[PDB]
Amino acid sequence: EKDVVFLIDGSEGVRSGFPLLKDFVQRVVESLDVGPDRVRVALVQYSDRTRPEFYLNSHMDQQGVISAIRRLTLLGGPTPNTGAALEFVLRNILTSSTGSRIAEGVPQLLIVLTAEPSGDDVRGPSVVLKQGGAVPIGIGIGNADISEMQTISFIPDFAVAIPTFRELGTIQQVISERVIQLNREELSSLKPILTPS
C-alpha cells in the first residue's frame, strides 16, 4: 500500500516541457501496482494557485490514471508558489476524505516537479509536511534551486537535479526504485531532516 501524489509545476516556465513531464509521470505510474488496495495515485498542478487534477480515490487501475495524465493541459500562471502548493497538498490531498490512507500509516509519497526557484518560501512548508507525515521527493529541472529541492525532500539524498526536461526520462527508474524502497518498514528506519536555511 502506498499513496503517491504528483505535485507538478504548471507555470509558464514549464509550458514547453509539459509533454515531457506528462511522459515522465506515466513512466513512473506504469511501474506501480495501481489499485485501491495497493497504490493510489493523485496529481495536482500548481502555479500561483493550485488545481487538483485527480485525487487518491479517483481511479482504480492503471488505465484510469494513465488516461487522466495523458489528457492534462497546462494550468498556466506566472510563477510556481511551491510552498503554498506543498501545504495545500498536506491539508487537502493527504486526507481521509480524498482517498489518503494516511490515518492507517500508509506511506504518503509526494513527488514534486518544478523548473524554477519557488515564488514563495518553501522552508516553513517543508517543515510542516515532514512533521505531518508526508515523504517528499523533490525533482528540480533546469533552473530549479538545488537547495530548495533538498529542503522539500524528506532527506536531501532523495532530491534530484536534472538540467533539462529532455533528461527527465533518465531518472524514471531511480524514482520508481525510491517509491519501492519507501514502504512502511523502511520508513520506520528513516527520519526526516529538518534544518531550514
Numbering used by the authors: 1024 to 1220
What does the literature reporting this entry say, word for word?
The murine collagen VI α3N5 domain was crystallized and its structure solved by molecular replacement at 1.2 Å resolution. The crystal asymmetric unit contains one molecule of collagen VI α3N5 comprising residues E1024–P1219. For the remaining five residues, S1220–G1224, poorer electron density precluded unambiguous model building. The structure has a central six-stranded hydrophobic β sheet flanked on either side by three amphipathic α helices. Like most of the collagen VI VWA domains, the α3N5 domain does not contain a conserved MIDAS motif. The C-terminal extension comprises a short α helix approximately at right angles with helix α6 followed by an extended region that cradles between the α4 and α5 helices of the N5 domain. Closer examination of the structure in this region shows that the extension is linked to the core domain by a salt bridge formed by residue R1207 from the C-terminal extension and E1024 from the core domain. Furthermore, residues L1210 and L1213 pack into a hydrophobic patch (patch 1; Figure 3, dark blue) formed by the residues P1130, L1132, V1158, and L1205 from the core domain, and a second hydrophobic patch (patch 2; Figure 3, light blue) is created by the side chains F1177, I1178, and P1179 from the core domain, which is buried by P1215 and I1216 from the C-terminal extension. The last two residues of the extension showing unique electron density, residues L1217 and P1219, interact with a hydrophobic ladder created by the long hydrophobic portions of the side chains of residues R1146, V1150, and K1153 of the α4 helix (green). As a result, the N and C termini are at opposite sides of the domain, which allows the formation of beads-on-a-string assemblies of multiple domains.
